[PDB]
């Protein structure tokens, strides 16, 4: 509930930033709004790439941290670790 709210707020702020900075380029804005024009399932599959080190996800490090902490708490509760 709160993880998705923080993610939504950040995705709105980043869209505001890209709409402010769209005047800089024409084709770079194209990749940048690829994320925003993608279908929601693809958007969230992209935003959920915190794992490993591929780093294509644009979500910030703190938001990565809450999910990485919840995931290890859940693994400890499941007994995998």
């Amino acid at each position: 509930d709160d993880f998705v709210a923080k993610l939504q707020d950040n995705q709105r702020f980043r869209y505001n930033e890209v709409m402010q900075a769209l005047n800089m380029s024409a084709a770079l804005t194209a990749r940048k709004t690829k994320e925003f024009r993608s279908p929601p399932q693809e958007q969230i599959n992209m935003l959920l790439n915190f794992k490993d080190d591929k780093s294509e996800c644009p979500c910030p490090e703190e938001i990565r941290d809450q999910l990485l902490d919840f995931h290890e708490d859940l693994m400890t509760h499941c007994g995998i670790e």
């Binding site: 998705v4 939504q8 995705q11 709105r12 804005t29 024009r37 929601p40 935003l47």
Partner: peptide, 19 residues
């Protein structure tokens, strides 16, 4: 190109659908 760029934001969706 603004309307073409803006298609379906995730933040516009209600909370439960995003959850």
């Amino acid at each position: 190109v603004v309307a073409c760029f803006r298609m379906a934001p995730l933040y516009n969706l209600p909370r439960h659908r995003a959850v």
